[PDB]
PDB file of C-alpha atoms in Angstrom:
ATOM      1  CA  UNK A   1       8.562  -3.149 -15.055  1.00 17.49           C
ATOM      2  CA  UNK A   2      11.196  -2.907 -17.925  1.00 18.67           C
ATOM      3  CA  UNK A   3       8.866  -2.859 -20.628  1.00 18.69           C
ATOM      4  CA  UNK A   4       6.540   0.679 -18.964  1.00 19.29           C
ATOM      5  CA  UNK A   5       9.819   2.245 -19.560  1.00 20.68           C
ATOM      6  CA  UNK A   6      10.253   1.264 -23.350  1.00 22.28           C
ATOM      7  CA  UNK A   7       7.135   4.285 -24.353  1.00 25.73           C
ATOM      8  CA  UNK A   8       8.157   6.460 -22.018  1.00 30.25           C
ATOM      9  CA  UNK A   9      11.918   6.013 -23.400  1.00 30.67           C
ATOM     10  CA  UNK A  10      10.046   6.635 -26.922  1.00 28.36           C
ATOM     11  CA  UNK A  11       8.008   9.514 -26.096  1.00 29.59           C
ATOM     12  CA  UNK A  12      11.027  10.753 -24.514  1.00 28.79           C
ATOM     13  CA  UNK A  13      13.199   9.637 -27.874  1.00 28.45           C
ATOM     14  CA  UNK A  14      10.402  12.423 -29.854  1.00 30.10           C
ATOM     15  CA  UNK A  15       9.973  15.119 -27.651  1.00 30.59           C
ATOM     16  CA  UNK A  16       8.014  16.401 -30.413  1.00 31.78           C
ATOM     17  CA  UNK A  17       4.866  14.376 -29.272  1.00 33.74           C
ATOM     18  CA  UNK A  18       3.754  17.025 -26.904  1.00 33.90           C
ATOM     19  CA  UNK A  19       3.308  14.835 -24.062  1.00 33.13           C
ATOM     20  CA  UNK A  20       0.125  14.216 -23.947  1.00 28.76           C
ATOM     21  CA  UNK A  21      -1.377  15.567 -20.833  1.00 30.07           C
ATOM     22  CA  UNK A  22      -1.362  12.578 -19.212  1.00 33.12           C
ATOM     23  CA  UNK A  23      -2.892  12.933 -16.769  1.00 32.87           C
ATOM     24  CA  UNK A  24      -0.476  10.892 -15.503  1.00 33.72           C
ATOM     25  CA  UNK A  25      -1.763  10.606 -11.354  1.00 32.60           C
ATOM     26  CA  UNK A  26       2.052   8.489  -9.904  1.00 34.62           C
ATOM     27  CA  UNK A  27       1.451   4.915  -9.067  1.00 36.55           C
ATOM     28  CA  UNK A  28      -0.383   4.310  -6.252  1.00 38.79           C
ATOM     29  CA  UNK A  29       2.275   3.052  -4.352  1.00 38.66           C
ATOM     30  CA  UNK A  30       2.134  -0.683  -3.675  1.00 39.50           C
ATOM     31  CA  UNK A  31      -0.326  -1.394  -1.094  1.00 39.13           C
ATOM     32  CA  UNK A  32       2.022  -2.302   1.781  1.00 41.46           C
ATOM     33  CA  UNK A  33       2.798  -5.859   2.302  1.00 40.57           C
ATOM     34  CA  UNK A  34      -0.141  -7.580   4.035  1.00 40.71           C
ATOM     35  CA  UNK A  35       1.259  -7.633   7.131  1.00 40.62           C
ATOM     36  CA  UNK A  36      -0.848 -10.808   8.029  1.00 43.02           C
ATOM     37  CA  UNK A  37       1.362 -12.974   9.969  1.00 43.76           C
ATOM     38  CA  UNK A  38       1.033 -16.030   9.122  1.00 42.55           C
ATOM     39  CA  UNK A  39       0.986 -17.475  12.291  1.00 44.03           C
ATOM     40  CA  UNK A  40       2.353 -20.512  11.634  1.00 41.39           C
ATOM     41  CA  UNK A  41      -0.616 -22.536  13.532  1.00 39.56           C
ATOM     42  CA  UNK A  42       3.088 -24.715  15.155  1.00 36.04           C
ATOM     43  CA  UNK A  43       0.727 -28.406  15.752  1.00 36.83           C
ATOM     44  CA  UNK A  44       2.805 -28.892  19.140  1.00 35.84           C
ATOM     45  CA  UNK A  45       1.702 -32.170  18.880  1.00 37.48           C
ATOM     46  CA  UNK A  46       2.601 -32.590  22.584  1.00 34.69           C
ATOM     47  CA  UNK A  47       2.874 -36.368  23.369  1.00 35.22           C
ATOM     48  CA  UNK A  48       1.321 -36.387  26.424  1.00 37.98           C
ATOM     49  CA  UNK A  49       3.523 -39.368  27.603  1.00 37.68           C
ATOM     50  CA  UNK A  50       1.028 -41.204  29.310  1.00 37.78           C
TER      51      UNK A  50
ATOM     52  CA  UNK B   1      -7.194 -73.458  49.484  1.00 40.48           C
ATOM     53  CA  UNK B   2     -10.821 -72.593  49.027  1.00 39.44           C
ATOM     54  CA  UNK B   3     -11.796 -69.798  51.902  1.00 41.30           C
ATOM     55  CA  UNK B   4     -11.237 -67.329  49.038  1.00 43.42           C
ATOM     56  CA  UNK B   5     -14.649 -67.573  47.245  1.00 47.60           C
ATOM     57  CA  UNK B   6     -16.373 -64.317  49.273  1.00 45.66           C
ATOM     58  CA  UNK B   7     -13.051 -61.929  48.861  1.00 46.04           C
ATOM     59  CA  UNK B   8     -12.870 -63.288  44.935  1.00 46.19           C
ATOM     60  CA  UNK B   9     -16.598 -61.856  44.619  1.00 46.38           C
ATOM     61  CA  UNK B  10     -15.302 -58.327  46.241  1.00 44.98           C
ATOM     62  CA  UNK B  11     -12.079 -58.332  44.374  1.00 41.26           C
ATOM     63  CA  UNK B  12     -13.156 -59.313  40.561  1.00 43.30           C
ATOM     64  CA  UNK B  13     -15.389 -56.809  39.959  1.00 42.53           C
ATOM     65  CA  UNK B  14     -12.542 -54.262  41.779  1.00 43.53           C
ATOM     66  CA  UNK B  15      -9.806 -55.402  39.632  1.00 40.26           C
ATOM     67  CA  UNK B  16     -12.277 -55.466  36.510  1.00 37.08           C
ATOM     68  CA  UNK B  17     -13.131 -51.811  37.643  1.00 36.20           C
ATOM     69  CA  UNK B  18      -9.725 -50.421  37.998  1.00 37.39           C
ATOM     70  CA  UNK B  19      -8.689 -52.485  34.904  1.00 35.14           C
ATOM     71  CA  UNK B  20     -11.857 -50.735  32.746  1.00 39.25           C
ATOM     72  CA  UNK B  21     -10.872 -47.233  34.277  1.00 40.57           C
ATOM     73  CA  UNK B  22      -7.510 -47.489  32.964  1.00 41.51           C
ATOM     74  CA  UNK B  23      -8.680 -48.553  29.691  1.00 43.89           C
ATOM     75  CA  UNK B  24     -11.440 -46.114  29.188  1.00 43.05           C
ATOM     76  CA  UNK B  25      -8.393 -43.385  30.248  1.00 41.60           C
ATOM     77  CA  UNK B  26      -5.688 -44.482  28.092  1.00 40.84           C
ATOM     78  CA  UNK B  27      -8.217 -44.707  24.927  1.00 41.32           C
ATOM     79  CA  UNK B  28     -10.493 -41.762  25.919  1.00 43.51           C
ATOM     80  CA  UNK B  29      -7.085 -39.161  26.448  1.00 45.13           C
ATOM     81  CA  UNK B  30      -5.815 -39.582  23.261  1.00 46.88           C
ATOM     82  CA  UNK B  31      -8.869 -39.679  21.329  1.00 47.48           C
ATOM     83  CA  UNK B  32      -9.378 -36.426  22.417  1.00 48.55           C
ATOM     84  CA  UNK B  33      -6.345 -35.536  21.780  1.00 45.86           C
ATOM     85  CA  UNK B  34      -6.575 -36.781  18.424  1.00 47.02           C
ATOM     86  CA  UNK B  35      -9.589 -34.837  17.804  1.00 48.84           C
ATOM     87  CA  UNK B  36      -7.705 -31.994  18.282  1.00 44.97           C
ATOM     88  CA  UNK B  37      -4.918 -32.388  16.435  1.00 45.02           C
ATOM     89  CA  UNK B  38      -7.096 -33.406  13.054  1.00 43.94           C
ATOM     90  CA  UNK B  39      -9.400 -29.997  13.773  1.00 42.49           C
ATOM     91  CA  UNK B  40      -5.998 -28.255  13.827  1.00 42.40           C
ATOM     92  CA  UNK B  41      -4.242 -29.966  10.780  1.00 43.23           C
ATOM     93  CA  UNK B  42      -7.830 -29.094   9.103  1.00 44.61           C
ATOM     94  CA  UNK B  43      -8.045 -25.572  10.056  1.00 44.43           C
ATOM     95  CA  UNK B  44      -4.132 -24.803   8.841  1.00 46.64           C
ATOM     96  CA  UNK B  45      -4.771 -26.734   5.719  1.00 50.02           C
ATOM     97  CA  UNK B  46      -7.908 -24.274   5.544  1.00 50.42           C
ATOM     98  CA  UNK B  47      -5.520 -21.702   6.228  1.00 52.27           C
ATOM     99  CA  UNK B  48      -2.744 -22.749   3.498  1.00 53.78           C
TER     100      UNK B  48
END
């Protein structure tokens, strides 16, 4: 994530590169934590005390 | 002694029954049990 910003920081260190167009669509936003629960399957190894 | 051969035939094979009950409950519980407990360590290893 530090390095992404080293071009940018160069294209914006020459602002006579006409920015190419990019076409830059913004991240995608980081698909949202799986919220999968690991349900921690807890083996209650109850000892039935026979 | 000795008017105790008839009741020894009827209590034996009582005593041996109780005696096998108990044994085929105290091994037969926990072998299920245990059969449970290794499908469920399995499927959370599978899980892991």
């Amino acid at each position: 994530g530090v390095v992404k910003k080293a071009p940018s920081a160069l294209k914006a260190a020459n602002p006579s590169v006409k920015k190419p167009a990019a076409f830059l669509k913004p991240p995608v936003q980081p698909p949202s934590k799986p919220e999968g629960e690991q349900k921690a399957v807890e083996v209650k190894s109850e000892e039935t005390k026979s | 002694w000795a008017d105790y051969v008839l009741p020894l035939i009827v209590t034996v094979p009582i005593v041996v029954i109780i005696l096998s009950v108990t044994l085929g409950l105290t091994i037969g519980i926990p072998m299920h049990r245990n059969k449970k407990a290794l499908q469920a360590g399995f499927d959370l290893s599978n899980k892991k």
